[PDB]
Amino acid sequence: GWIRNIGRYLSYLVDDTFEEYAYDVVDGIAKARTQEELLEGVYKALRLAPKLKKKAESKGCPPPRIPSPEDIEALEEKVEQLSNPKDLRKLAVSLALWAFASWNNCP
């Protein structure tokens, strides 16, 4: 459900193979109470795409893949109607939950 693809992209900010350790964005996406800050955090996480691209390119392993545009609108087609924070947490926490998965990137 377009969760693994974005989780593997968020995993690029925590893994030691990318020696930048973007942990603030993980806290922002996990600690989201309403609509605006969750989108702000996911934008901040996605903004570091060239960082990861040039880090993997300059290190040797294949560059990371950006989340596909096909499920980008899928993110906003559901979170819009999660007016209640209680059910919004089920996805806000899960976004960072999948950010710590194994996600083998470079050999």
Partner 1 sequence: MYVRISGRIRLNAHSLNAQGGGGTNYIEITKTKVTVRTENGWTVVEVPAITGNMLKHWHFVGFVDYFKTTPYGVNLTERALRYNGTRFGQGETTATKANGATVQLNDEATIIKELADADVHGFLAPKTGRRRVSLVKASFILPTEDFIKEVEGERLITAIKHNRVDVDEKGAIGSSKEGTAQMLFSREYATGLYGFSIVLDLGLVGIPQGLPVKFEENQPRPNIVIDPNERKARIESALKALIPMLSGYIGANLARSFPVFKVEELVAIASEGPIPALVHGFYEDYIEANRSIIKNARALGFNIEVFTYNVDLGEDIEATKVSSVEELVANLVKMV
Partner 2 sequence: FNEFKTPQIDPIFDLYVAYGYVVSLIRGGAKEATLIPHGASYLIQTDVSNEEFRHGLVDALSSMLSLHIALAKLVSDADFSAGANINNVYWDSVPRNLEKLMKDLEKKRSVKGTATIPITLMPSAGKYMLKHFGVQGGNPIKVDLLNYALAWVGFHYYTPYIKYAKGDTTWIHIYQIAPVEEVDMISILSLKDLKMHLPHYYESNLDFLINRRLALLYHLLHSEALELFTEKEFVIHSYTLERSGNNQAIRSFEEEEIGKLMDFLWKLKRRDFYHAIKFIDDLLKKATEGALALIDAIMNERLEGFYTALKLGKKAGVVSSREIVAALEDIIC
Contact residues: its own copies, CB under 8 A: 3-4, 7, 11, 14, 21, 23, 26-27, 30, 35-36, 39-40, 42-43, 46-47, 49-50, 65-69, 72-73, 76, 86-87, 89-90, 93-94, 96-98, 100-103
Return the residue of 33, 68, 78, 104 that touches partner 1, per CB under 8 A.
33
Alpha-helical (H) ranges within the chain are 4-10, 24-30, 35-47, 49-57, 72-79, 85-97
**Residue partners of 53: CB distance under 8 A and separation at least 6:** 63, 64
36 C-beta neighbours (distance < 10 Å), count: 9
- Residues 40 and 46: their CA atoms lie apart, in Å, by 10
Give the interface segment with partner 2, choosing from 37-45, 46-54, 56-64, 98-106 (CB under 8 A): 98-106
Enumerate binding residues for partner 1 (CB under 8 A): 19-21, 23-24, 28, 31, 33-34, 37, 50-55, 58, 86, 89
